[PDB]
C-alpha cells in the first residue's frame, strides 16, 4: 500500500512484542527464581534513493545521501541473568545462590540442565530433587536413618544420625558457571539447558573458583523489580500508542488522497 | 469492454477475498487450535504487444518490450502452523499439544480426521469424545467407577478407581504427524483430513519421531495476532477504496466516449 503503512506495521509488531514480554514478566513477579526477560531489536532494509557517495560533479560529493529505511525486526528475546534479592523461608532444604552460579540438574530425559533455584527435596529413594525430580550431579543419596539435614555454604550437604554427634558429609553440591549466562534456553520449570550460545559450563565448587555463596534458609526471589518494569511498561505503552497513531495517520492520509 | 475494467474487476475480487480471509481469522479468535490463514496473490496473463527481445534492426534489440498485464488471481492461502499460546484452564479433560502433531479422530463415515483440540469429553458410554461425539483414536474407554483421569506428557492415560490405590492404565493417546501441515484440507468442526499435498500420516507416540508433548489442564489458543489483523483490515479497506476509484475512472472515460 503506502510505505509508511508498512513501516508502522513493523513498528506495531515490535512494540506488541515488547508489551508481550513485559506482560509475561509481570506474570512471574514474586515467583522465585525468575529472570527479567528483555527484547532486542534490529532495523530492516534501507531503500537507497541517492547513494551517500554518488559524486554529483567532477568535484561535488553530496554528503549525507538520501535513504529511507524500513522496519524494526526483533532479533531476539534474550534472558537477563542478573542477581536478584533473597527472602527468608527458614527452610534447610531451600538454598539460594549469591553471585555467579547455576545449579546442575540431571534431566529426567537424560540430558543436563541448570537452574538458579535451590528449593531441593528428598524423595522416597533419597535422591536430591527440587519440585519435579531435578537430580543434581554428582548423585547424593540421603540416608534413610537421617535426623537433621544441613547444607553448608560451601556446597557440602550432610546429615545427622541418632547417637553419634558428628556431622558427616554425605554429598557435595557444587555450582556451574557459564561464559554467557544469557544464551541458555529454558525447558520450563526455570530449567535452562546447555546451549551453543551459553559457553562451556564449568563445574566449580562454591566459594572457590570465583563462584558465589550458598544461603541456607533463603530463596532467591525473581529479579523482577516492580518499579523498574512498571517504568518499562509506561515507556513501552507510549511507544505502542504513538506507533498506532502513525498507522491511523497513514490511514487518514490515504482517505484524504481518495476523497480527492 | 475496456481492457482496464476487467483488470480493476480482478483487483476488486482480490481485495474481497483477502478481506474474507481477514474476517475469518478475526472471528475465530477464542477458538482453540485454530490456525491463522494468509492469502497469497499472483498476477495473471501479460498480453504482449512487443516482445521484450525481438531485435528490431540488425543492431537494435528493443529492451523492455511492451506488455500490459491483467489481474491479481489469488493463487493460494497458506495456514500458519505455529505453536499457539497455552493457557491454564484447570480442567482435566483439556489436553493441549506442545509441538508438531494432531489427534486422530474417527468420523461417522468411517474415514479418519485430525484435530488439535483437546477440550475432550466423556459420553454416556464413557468413551473419549470431542464435542460432537467424535471418538478419538485409538478408542479409549474410561471405566464407570473412575474418579479422575490423568493424561501424562507421554500420552499414557490412566484413571483412579475408587477403593483400589492404583492408577490402572486405560490407554495410550498417540499423535499424528504430517510432512506438510499446511497442505491438510480443513473441513470445519476444527477437523482436518488427509490429502496428497499433506502426505501419508505418520502415527507416533508423543515425544518420538518429532511429535509433540501433551499438557493436561492447558488449552492451545488460536495464534491470531489481533494487531496484524487490524492493520491488514485498514490496508484492505484502503485498497478496496483505490480499486473502486479505478473502476469509477474507467467508467467516466467510457461515458465521455459514449457522449461523443
Amino acid at each position: 500500500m503506502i510505505s509508511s503503512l508498512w513501516i508502522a506495521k513493523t513498528g506495531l509488531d515490535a512494540q506488541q512484542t515488547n508489551m508481550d514480554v513485559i506482560a509475561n514478566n509481570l506474570a512471574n513477579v514474586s515467583t522465585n527464581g525468575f529472570k527479567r526477560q528483555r527484547a532486542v531489536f534490529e532495523d530492516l532494509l534501507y531503500q537507497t534513493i541517492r547513494q551517500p557517495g554518488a559524486q554529483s560533479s567532477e568535484q561535488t560529493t553530496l554528503p549525507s545521501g538520501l535513504q529511507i529505511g524500513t522496519g524494526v525486526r526483533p532479533v531476539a528475546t534474550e534472558r537477563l541473568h542478573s542477581q536478584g534479592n533473597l527472602s527468608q523461608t527458614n527452610n534447610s532444604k531451600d538454598v539460594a545462590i549469591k553471585g555467579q552460579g547455576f545449579f546442575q540438574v540431571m534431566l529426567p530425559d537424560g540430558t543436563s540442565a541448570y537452574t538458579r533455584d535451590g528449593s531441593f527435596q528428598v524423595d522416597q529413594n533419597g535422591q536430591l530433587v527440587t519440585a519435579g525430580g531435578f537430580q543434581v550431579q554428582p548423585a547424593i543419596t540421603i540416608p534413610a536413618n537421617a535426623l537433621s539435614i544441613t547444607i553448608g555454604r560451601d556446597g557440602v550437604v550432610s546429615v545427622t544420625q541418632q547417637g553419634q554427634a558428628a556431622p558427616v558429609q554425605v554429598g557435595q553440591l557444587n555450582l556451574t558457571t557459564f561464559m554467557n549466562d544469557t544464551g541458555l534456553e529454558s525447558i520450563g520449570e526455570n530449567l535452562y539447558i546447555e546451549t551453543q550460545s551459553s559457553g562451556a559450563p564449568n563445574e566449580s565448587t562454591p566459594g572457590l573458583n570465583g563462584a558465589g555463596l550458598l544461603y541456607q534458609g533463603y530463596v532467591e526471589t525473581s529479579n523482577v523489580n516492580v518499579a523498574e518494569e512498571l517504568v518499562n511498561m509506561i515507556q513501552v505503552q507510549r511507544a505502542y500508542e504513538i506507533n498506532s497513531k502513525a498507522v491511523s495517520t497513514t490511514d487518514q492520509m490515504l482517505q484524504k488522497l481518495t476523497q480527492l | 469492454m475496456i481492457s482496464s475494467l476487467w483488470i480493476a474487476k480482478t483487483g476488486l475480487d482480490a481485495q474481497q477475498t483477502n478481506m474474507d480471509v481477514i474476517a475469518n481469522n478475526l472471528a475465530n479468535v477464542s477458538t482453540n487450535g485454530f490456525k491463522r490463514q494468509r492469502a497469497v496473490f499472483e498476477d495473471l496473463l501479460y498480453q504482449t504487444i512487443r516482445q521484450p527481445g525481438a531485435q528490431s534492426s540488425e543492431q537494435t534489440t528493443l529492451p523492455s518490450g511492451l506488455q500490459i498485464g491483467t489481474g491479481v488471481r489469488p493463487v493460494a492461502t497458506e495456514r500458519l502452523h505455529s505453536q499457539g499460546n497455552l493457557s491454564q484452564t484447570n480442567n482435566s479433560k483439556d489436553v493441549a499439544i506442545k509441538g508438531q502433531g494432531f489427534f486422530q479422530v474417527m468420523l461417522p463415515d468411517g474415514t479418519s480426521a485430525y484435530t488439535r483440540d483437546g477440550s475432550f469429553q466423556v459420553d454416556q458410554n464413557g468413551q473419549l469424545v470431542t464435542a460432537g461425539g467424535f471418538q478419538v483414536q485409538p478408542a479409549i474407554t474410561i471405566p464407570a467407577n473412575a474418579l479422575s483421569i490423568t493424561i501424562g506428557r507421554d500420552g499414557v492415560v490412566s484413571v483412579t478407581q475408587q477403593g483400589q490405590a492404583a492408577p490402572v492404565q486405560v490407554g495410550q493417546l498417540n499423535l499424528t504427524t504430517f510432512m506438510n501441515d499446511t497442505g491438510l484440507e480443513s473441513i470445519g468442526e476444527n477437523l482436518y483430513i488427509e490429502t496428497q499435498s499433506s502426505g501419508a500420516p505418520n502415527e507416533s507416540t508423543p515425544g518420538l519421531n518429532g511429535a509433540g508433548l501433551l499438557y493436561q489442564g492447558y488449552v492451545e489458543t488460536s495464534n491470531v495476532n489481533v494487531a496484524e489483523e487490524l492493520v491488514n483490515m485498514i490496508q484492505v479497506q484502503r485498497a478496496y477504496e483505490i480499486n473502486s476509484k479505478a473502476v469509477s475512472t474507467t467508467d467516466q472515460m467510457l461515458q465521455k466516449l459514449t457522449q461523443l
Binding site: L26, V29, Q237, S244, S248 | V231
Partner: peptide, 25 residues
C-alpha cells in the same frame, strides 16, 4: 498484587487501532 494480573492481562487485547492512551494508563 490483585490489580496486577488484571493489569498485565489488560495489555493483551490491546487493539492498536485504539490503544491505552498515556492519560488512561
Amino acid at each position: 498484587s490483585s490489580f496486577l494480573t488484571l493489569l498485565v492481562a489488560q495489555l493483551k487485547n490491546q487493539d492498536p487501532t485504539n490503544p491505552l492512551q498515556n492519560n488512561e494508563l
